[PDB]
Amino acid sequence: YEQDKTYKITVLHTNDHHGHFWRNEYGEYGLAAQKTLVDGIRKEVAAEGGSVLLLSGGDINTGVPESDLQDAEPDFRGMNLVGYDAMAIGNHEFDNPLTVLRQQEKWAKFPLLSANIYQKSTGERLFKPWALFKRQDLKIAVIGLTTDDTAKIGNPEYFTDIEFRKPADEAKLVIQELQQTEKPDIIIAATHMGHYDNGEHGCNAPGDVEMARALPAGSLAMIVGGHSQDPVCMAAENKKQVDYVPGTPCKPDQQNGIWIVQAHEWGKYVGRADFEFRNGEMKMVNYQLIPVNLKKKVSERVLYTPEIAENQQMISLLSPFQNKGKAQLEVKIGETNGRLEGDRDKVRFVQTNMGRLILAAQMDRTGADFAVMSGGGIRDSIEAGDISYKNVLKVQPFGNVVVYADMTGKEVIDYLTAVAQMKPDSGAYPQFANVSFVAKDGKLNDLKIKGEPVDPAKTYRMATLNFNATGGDGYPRLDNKCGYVNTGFIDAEVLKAYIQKSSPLDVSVYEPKGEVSWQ
């Protein structure tokens, strides 16, 4: 690269887009606003003779019905118009068969990268490990890495002849081969692994911090991350800000001479790392997270930072997808031969069939042995007859995320005991599935899971919602348990997909028969 010259690289990034091609109902984010933002940063940087690179940390799939229903086609096409250069493959890129992921690679005009995803039968990579970019006469390599938790999480589906090797180990190999064969001026890793304070990954697969620490110092300029779904803005050494506020300064993490960034989720921000490159080394000049029309409830909603207009061309591209998405919510996904009871004065007093249907859906998605939610979370009934996604969204309107915890029998006893204290005639009244007992005097008698007494030596998987897992309605906190996993699947999508594949539903199968009682 021509010697003793300082060059200017700006790296933009997003991650964990999760189907948010369209603005939300308050005019926040969406790719049309993202397009305007990125186009302006491009024009600015090009007027200063610098270079731009736009990377995604992945998880483009899964999270919004109008996207999910169309296999994220709008999202990938919109990304083409924004002009992404590359993305790392996320675990949610495996929510669909490989057919669909291969199809997303066709739609995408940028490479979907992952070095550590291998075909079992051949020992060969399924995807490109990296991509090379020429910015001016700089040679820049972007490697992709995917969390090796991908196939371990929930009830895994589409991993036929595939495996996920340790990304940290793959990174070593891949960096070494690149330096040897290409001598990139800059290597960046787009990853889908997660940021954990001080590398405290708990029972999750090690993520970016740990990888950064294990690599030779400064051997990557930066890691552009995702999966954990945080704004990586450090309040203190090895401690991210809690409740990071849009439009305030964001200090990215630096670990063993490698900058680690993450732009939260859903296109909420476009992150901007301005670097200067001289003599093979990279210096970070500035870092920020630019909100994409984020708003705070103050009752109305107000911008944090200047309004970014929606690119007209992105609106014309995406609208037909939006509109086709909405229409498809009206279509029959299934049928039931009986009324599923979701009325407030039932679901907050007794176990109902809708409770069991939802919880069945959540167990099925997670591989759980049992499940709980609060009655205040079932928000409508579905009448006998045909069922649409629009019906499911009335029943599950708050967009809670399905999660699970692996717990000892003893932790099961204590959790259920505590939950059993919640009283009828409140939203905190619990719906259970695969649980039986008679509560007497704050104590559970004959406690069983799936017909069997709870063995404190065994591990049980429980499904519920993030809302309850984080202490909603005074439920015991699970989000700090080693073994807690937020799956990222939305309650309503999980209920709809279960209804669709299970239909026609025979509701009798969801009828409680006195498994739980209080005296």
State yes or no: residue 77 binds Ni ion (CB under 5 A).
no
State yes or no: residue 59 binds Ni ion (CB under 5 A).
yes
- Residue (195 or 461) nearer to Ni ion, CB: 195
**Residue 180 appears among annotated catalytic residues:** no
Residue 472 annotated as part of some ligand binding site: yes
User: What Cα–Cα distance (Å) separates residue 243 from each residue in 200, 246, 264, 265, 403?
Assistant: 19, 9, 11, 14, 21
Please say whether the beta carbons of 144 and 191 come within 8 A: yes
**Residue 77 appears among annotated catalytic residues:** no
Q: Please tell me which residue in 15, 16, 148, 253 is annotated as part of the active site.
A: 16
Q: Give the nearest distance from C-beta 162 to Ni ion in angstroms.
A: 16
Nearest C-alpha neighbor of 138 from the set 186, 199, 194: 186
Q: Please tell me which residue in 92, 272, 365, 461 is annotated as part of the active site.
A: 92
**Residue 80 appears among annotated catalytic residues:** no
Residue 434 annotated as part of some ligand binding site: no
**Residue 119 appears among annotated catalytic residues:** no
Rounded to 5 degrees, φ, ψ at 176 are -65, -45
- Rounded to whole angstroms, the Cα distance separating 23 from 35 reads 12
Q: Please tell me which residue in 195, 264, 348, 461 is annotated as part of the active site.
A: 348
**Residue 13 appears among annotated catalytic residues:** no
**Residue 17 appears among annotated catalytic residues:** no
* Of 2-10, 55-63, 495-503, 511-519: span binding Ni ion (CB under 5 A): 55-63
Q: Which two tokens stand for residue 157?
A: 């589906």
- Residue (62 or 353) nearer to Ni ion, CB: 62
x/- map, 90-129, Ni ion, by CB under 5 A: xx--------------------------------------
HSE on the CB side for 11, CA within 13 Å? 35
- Residue (207 or 472) nearer to Ni ion, CB: 207
Nearest C-alpha neighbor of 329 from the set 398, 393, 395, 390: 390
Q: Is-cis flag, bond preceding 504, omega within 30?
A: yes
- Residue (50 or 90) nearer to Ni ion, CB: 90
State yes or no: residue 19 binds Ni ion (CB under 5 A).
no
* Of 1-9, 195-203, 220-228, 411-419: span binding Ni ion (CB under 5 A): 220-228
- Residue (17 or 135) nearer to Ni ion, CB: 17
Q: Please tell me which residue in 42, 165, 301, 379 is annotated as part of the active site.
A: 379
Please say whether the beta carbons of 88 and 146 come within 8 A: yes
Nearest C-alpha neighbor of 81 from the set 133, 33, 26: 33
**String of b and e for 216-237 (b: at least 16 CB within 10 Å)?**
eeebbbbbbbbbbbbbbbbeee
State yes or no: residue 154 binds Ni ion (CB under 5 A).
no
Contacting residue, 13, 77, 135, 227, with Ni ion by CB under 5 A? 227
Q: Please tell me which residue in 192, 201, 356, 461 is annotated as part of the active site.
A: 192
Q: In the bound complex, which residue of the shown chain has the CB atom lying closest to Ni ion?
A: 227
- Rounded to whole angstroms, the Cα distance separating 501 from 489 reads 17
Q: Give the nearest distance from C-beta 338 to Ni ion in angstroms.
A: 37
Residue 347 annotated as part of some ligand binding site: yes
Q: Give the nearest distance from C-beta 208 to Ni ion in angstroms.
A: 13
Count of residues engaged in binding Ni ion, rule: CB under 5 A: 4
State yes or no: residue 17 binds Ni ion (CB under 5 A).
no
* Of 5-13, 84-92, 465-473, 497-505: span binding Ni ion (CB under 5 A): 84-92
| 414 burial level (CB within 10 Å; 0-12, 13-18, 19+) | middle
- Rounded to whole angstroms, the Cα distance separating 392 from 335 reads 12
Q: Please tell me which residue in 68, 95, 230, 491 is annotated as part of the active site.
A: 95
State yes or no: residue 15 binds Ni ion (CB under 5 A).
no
- Residue (90 or 334) nearer to Ni ion, CB: 90
How many other CB atoms are there within 10 angstroms of residue 443's CB atom?
Answer: 11
Strand segments (E) across 158-312: 162-164, 186-192, 222-224, 234-236, 239-240, 253-255, 258-261, 269-278, 281-291, 295-297, 301-303
**Residue 18 appears among annotated catalytic residues:** yes
**Residue 201 appears among annotated catalytic residues:** no
Nearest C-alpha neighbor of 91 from the set 484, 461, 485: 485
**Residue 91 appears among annotated catalytic residues:** yes
Residue 437 annotated as part of some ligand binding site: no
- Residue (191 or 311) nearer to Ni ion, CB: 191
| 15 burial level (CB within 10 Å; 0-12, 13-18, 19+) | buried
Rounded to 5 degrees, φ, ψ at 365 are -65, -30
Q: List the alpha helices (DSSP H) in 113-206.
A: 167-181
Q: Give the nearest distance from C-beta 479 to Ni ion in angstroms.
A: 16
Q: Give the nearest distance from C-beta 225 to Ni ion in angstroms.
A: 10
State yes or no: residue 264 binds Ni ion (CB under 5 A).
no
Residue 227 annotated as part of some ligand binding site: yes
Residue 305 annotated as part of some ligand binding site: no
- Residue (90 or 111) nearer to Ni ion, CB: 90
* Of 27-35, 58-66, 311-319, 350-358: span binding Ni ion (CB under 5 A): 58-66
Residue 471 annotated as part of some ligand binding site: yes
**Residue 95 appears among annotated catalytic residues:** yes
* Alpha carbon 350 to chain centroid, angstroms: 33
Q: What is the residue type of 206?
A: P
Q: Give the nearest distance from C-beta 115 to Ni ion in angstroms.
A: 17
Q: Please tell me which residue in 15, 204, 229, 362 is annotated as part of the active site.
A: 229
Torsion of CA 58, 75, 289, 196, to 10 degrees: -20
Residue 160 annotated as part of some ligand binding site: no
Q: Interface residues with Ni ion (CB under 5 A)?
A: 59, 90-91, 227
The catalytic site residues sit at 16, 18, 59, 91-92, 95, 192, 227, 229, 344, 348, 379
Query: Residues forming the annotated binding site for substrate?
Result: 344-348, 467-473
